[PDB]
Design a protein around this ligand. Structure first.
Ligand code: Y01
Lengths: 585, 117
């Protein structure tokens, strides 16, 4: 491999696609109130590129079939943003979430603390993961090492963002979603023809083992490379199986409620629509599109394990370092090996071009949002008398610091949680996210909390999560032959049984602290909670829609279509749990 | 590949008995609904007997009372004890299996010839 790209039939395809995208941006640089179809594609492609092509396919090739029930929970939580939470942001005159928590409670410490937390979550979750995924794609396709691929990815995204790649982010986004969704079905059709149908795919996956199992003297265990006994179950054992069904339903809901409703890019995307019917149309279209990645991206991971078993399922550490560069595991190369070694001479370049052009826009979006969040909300509250030139050079001397810190952090990403990228992202989110959602829901619905409770709730949740996160990396997670010497009190349970405990403890602390101090009168709290959302008086506080009005026909049509989408998702969940296979001894 | 080996054909008189077997080999799973299907020479197929996994036998109304079918537990072997034979039920017999309750009869058997009188 690695010399299958050196032909004249697809280098021209890569060059022509990149010149087309840069020409579209350079034309839209010279010469608000959107409609339903751009919002749907902009919401469906938010985390694709590194949370669809690496994480889902690798955990499908390593664990089994239960990973695919992530997007169905995501669409159920996507229907709540349009119907419940966006009229709260419109009816209060607010754009983002810390600007809501400044107008609700008061003071100046909650906003600064939430900005400082959001920057660290950006660094740990998005930037280093995007750079690592781009380096994986370049190292599989061409053949250079890691340090010669990171600087190539950065030197291409700089040319992307110079020629107006942030203005025109609607045409190129709809184009990339359409081309990627069309091209991801032909690879499934090519994959299911190679193994020989759907029954031989079931019968052959349970015998995919490597043929080099021994060391020089350390013969490896029998259970360490054979597939699991429950690979075709959706709901697994709640005590001894990975991804257990209580965590799989409750902890993913707690982790998705923070991500879909209290974000910054998604909320400002939905708040820029023309009317209130178009937000709901855009929320229905992405929910219809999020039913596919079980059949499109999880099941080709198992085909990639079946066809090439000595690379994707290696176990001996003198052999796994030769193939993927790390001595822990090699499941991350499951999907980029299928694209290079099965596609014909034409589409093999177009798929790599689509994946890289979807990986660069995310990066520019993050670099712009973090620059605004640092300059406006932390640095301008220290000096208070800064001009525009000083703020421009401060905003431009910050992304260099972010890039250097993320590139330094990368060699911990590629060796965490035994070599999988789904578990790393979900465990970091489970340790740092759940104290925010409890304080958000208790601020909206209960009307009696004040500023003295929310701050100490956030601080105590931060202390617990940071203790577990520091103890996890300094001791390691463990292995197959030698388990880890973790203190097995805070380190014993699954990482999805930690989110529920942290959620409950943060809520209990803010209620107990809030019931011991002075309240806030309801003169200041008009149209800022759920009970007083329809008051008409004035409050003495501490192209563009502002009304949330709609015709009485399209309201009925949207209600009926949301009910039908919920029925389809429930039927899929009831199909894959009613007939699952059981092996014999 | 999965293949079904069966045996137990022959020739009896009107009022005898026989014994038919079926045994899949080469798989790793447990089948759900191992059954039987007969077909007269020159006619169309029909249903005879069927036993599920936990045990729920489902006969046909024109044969109930004379046939008895039993399957071993947690493995793939199913018998059929036919009693008081007539010369009307002379046909070949197939053996069908199934993976899951909603998936429509994956593998079929070869065929065992049995005629009477
Ligand atoms: C059927 C599957 C395979 C694909 C998905 C198709 C439908 C389920 C989607 C796509 C077309 C959508 C509709 C396109 C048109 C409209 C009208 C739109 O509002 C209007 O145009 C009328 C109100 C106004 O113009 O002010 C609101 C969303 C709605 C109902 C959409 C609801 C969701 C629909 C039916």
């Amino acid at each position: 491999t690695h010399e299958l790209i050196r032909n004249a039939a697809d280098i021209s395809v890569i060059v022509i696609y990149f010149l087309l995208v840069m020409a579209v941006g350079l034309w839209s640089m010279f010469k608000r109130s959107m409609v339903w179809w751009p919002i749907g594609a902009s919401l469906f492609a938010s985390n694709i590129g590194s949370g669809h092509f690496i994480g889902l396919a690798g955990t499908g090739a390593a664990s089994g079939l239960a990973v695919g029930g992530f997007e169905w929970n995501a669409l159920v939580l996507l229907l709540v943003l349009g119907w419940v939470f966006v009229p709260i942001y419109i009816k209060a005159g607010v754009v983002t979430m810390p600007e809501y928590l400044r107008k609700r409670f008061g003071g100046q410490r909650i906003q600064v603390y939430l900005s400082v937390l959001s920057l660290f979550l950006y660094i740990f979750t998005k930037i280093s993961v995007d750079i690592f995924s781009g380096a994986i794609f370049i190292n599989l396709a061409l053949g250079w090492n890691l340090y010669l691929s990171i600087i190539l990815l950065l030197a291409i995204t700089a040319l992307y963002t110079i020629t107006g790649g942030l203005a025109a982010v609607i045409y190129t986004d709809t184009l990339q979603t359409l081309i990627m969704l069309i091209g991801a079905l032909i690879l499934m059709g090519f994959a299911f023809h190679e193994v020989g149908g759907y029954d031989a795919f079931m019968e052959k996956y349970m015998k995919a083992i490597p043929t080099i199992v021994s060391d020089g003297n350390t013969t490896f265990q029998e259970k360490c490379y054979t597939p699991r006994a429950d690979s075709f179950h959706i709901f697994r054992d709640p005590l001894t199986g990975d991804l257990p069904w209580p965590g799989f339903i409750f902890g993913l809901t707690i982790l998705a409620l923070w991500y879909w409703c209290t974000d910054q890019v998604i909320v400002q995307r939905c708040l820029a629509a023309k009317n209130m019917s178009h937000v709901k149309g855009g929320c229905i279209l992405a929910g219809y599109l999020k039913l596919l990645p079980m059949f499109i991206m999880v099941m080709p991971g198992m085909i990639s394990r079946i066809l090439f078993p000595d690379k994707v399922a290696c176990v001996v550490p003198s052999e796994c370092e030769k193939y993927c560069g790390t001595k822990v595991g090699c499941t991350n190369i499951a999907y980029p090996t299928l694209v290079v070694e099965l596609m014909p001479n034409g589409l093999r370049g177009l798929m790599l071009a689509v994946m890289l052009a979807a990986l660069m826009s995310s990066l520019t979006s993050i670099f712009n949002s973090a620059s605004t969040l640092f300059t406006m909300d932390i640095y301008a509250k220290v000096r208070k008398r800064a001009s525009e030139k000083e703020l421009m050079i401060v905003g431009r001397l910050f992304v260099l610091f972010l890039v250097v810190v993320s590139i330094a952090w990368i060699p911990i990403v590629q060796s965490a949680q035994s070599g999988q990228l789904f578990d790393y992202i979900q465990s970091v989110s489970s340790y740092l996210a759940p104290p925010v959602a409890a304080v958000f829901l208790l601020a909206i619905f209960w009307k009696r909390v004040n500023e003295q409770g929310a701050f100490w709730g956030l601080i105590l949740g931060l202390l617990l999560g940071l203790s577990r996160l520091i103890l996890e990396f300094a001791y390691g997670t463990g292995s197959c032959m030698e388990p880890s010497n973790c203190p097995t009190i805070i380190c014993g349970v699954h990482y999805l049984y930690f989110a529920i405990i942290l959620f409950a403890i943060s809520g209990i602390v803010t209620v107990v602290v809030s019931l011991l101090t002075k309240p806030i009168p309801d003169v200041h709290l008009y149209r800022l909670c759920w009970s007083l959302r329809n008051s008409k008086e004035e409050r003495i506080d501490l192209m563009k829609m502002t009304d949330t009005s709609e015709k009485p026909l399209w309201r009925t049509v949207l209600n009926i279509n949301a009910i039908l989408l919920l029925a389809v998702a429930i039927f899929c969940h009831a199909y894959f749990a009613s007939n699952s296979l059981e092996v014999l001894f | 590949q999965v293949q079904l080996q069966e045996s137990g054909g022959g020739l009896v008189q009107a009022g005898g008995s026989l014994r038919l077997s079926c045994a899949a080999s080469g798989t790793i799973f447990v089948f759900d609904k191992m059954g039987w299907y007969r077909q007269a020479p020159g006619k169309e197929r029909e249903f005879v007997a069927t036993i599920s996994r936990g045990g729920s036998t489902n006969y046909a109304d024109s044969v109930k009372g004379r046939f008895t079918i039993s399957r071993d537990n947690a493995k793939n072997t199913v018998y059929l004890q036919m009693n008081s034979l007539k010369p009307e039920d002379t046909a070949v017999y197939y053996c069908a299996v199934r993976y899951t309750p909603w998936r429509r009869y994956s593998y079929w058997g070869q065929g065992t010839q049995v005629t009477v009188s």
